[PDB]
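Notebook, student rotation project (T.W.).
Task set for the rotation: take a protein with a known small-molecule partner, predict the structure of the complex, and write up what can be learned from the model alone. Partner molecule chosen: 8U0. Sequence and SMILES entered below by T.W., checked by me.
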Amino acid sequence: KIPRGNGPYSVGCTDLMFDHTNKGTFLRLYYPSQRLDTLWIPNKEYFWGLSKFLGTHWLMGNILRLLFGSMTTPANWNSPLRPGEKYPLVVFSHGLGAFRTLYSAIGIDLASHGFIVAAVEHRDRSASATYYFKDQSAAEIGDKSWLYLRTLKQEEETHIRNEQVRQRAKECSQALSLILDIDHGKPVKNALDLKFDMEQLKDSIDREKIAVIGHSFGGATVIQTLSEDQRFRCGIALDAWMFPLGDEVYSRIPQPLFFINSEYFQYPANIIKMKKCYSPDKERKMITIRGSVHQNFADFTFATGKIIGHMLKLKGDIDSNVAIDLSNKASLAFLQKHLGLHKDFDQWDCLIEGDDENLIPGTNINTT
Ligand SMILES: CC(=O)Nc1ccc(S(=O)(=O)Nc2ccc(Oc3ccc4ccccc4c3)cc2)cc1
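Predicted structure of the complex:
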């Protein structure tokens, strides 16, 4: 039910954890490859964590497991990397209560247009669930240590969310550094024991065409990561939740920055913070997909029927495939303009400006 990528490349998918601790990097890789069998949500504990995030008990955990536990996503698991070329790199940051696998609609479509996409799994305790290993012995027998989402008291939110977004930007940088090191032949031992050799990635990254993309909490991570890591050349923030960011960051984003909003998530206090990032000497774009809801950017907008997805706030008015296509095409055109790609994604340059029936330029919210 998750749409196949619309590009000409076929898409592989694998997982990489290095090192094995909770300070290491944990990402899912989508990439052009040389079967469509990747498990969407691969462990029972992610369903338990999703149930705690949603506010239900042990029951709703196993129910979610029974419904989706073997649902796949259209990527060739451990398929070989399509050799011959250098690929641009997107680092992707998930929202609160999500984890590394819940944005394959976006990851797989970018990979089919020639990107390698590194979807990181954050260990800031903003994920529903993630895991690490206490030592190499535990990794050798696959004995996972799970860390679940921390819920916060209202008195804590401001401080903790900002520390979390700094830790998330740190993890996006650490993912980039690892991928850039593998590109130069640094040897890695995947703490997971998968049939994909990371040596395939040697001399396979275009080290000047790096972008960071994020949804919600991940949208704030785009801004913190851009502010801190000059190696990233542009950012796309999908329905960014701006709260975690401190006041000092908004005037300290040099790179091109694209805001892609849904209609029904946004509110003035959030829009004003996006507007604090604007400067006449900096490249900023903003569009809003009409009729869309927060969840149109994550994969659960494709996991249920129209009527119940509409009921659970997983679907909006706009068709879920029309929304992700608009957002993906606008992203591809923006990436081409600011990464310098020699592709034909500028056919969608009208979308960066909101020139579609299903798009608003900027936002319908007004601020001072
Ligand atoms: C009140 C609140 O904190 N709200 C919120 C915050 C962040 C996001 S999120 O989009 O950024 N992260 C995310 C989290 C879980 C996901 O799985 C879901 C989501 C919603 C479901 C609804 C019904 C049944 C199953 C569901 C599974 C997907 C993405 C969403 C809501």
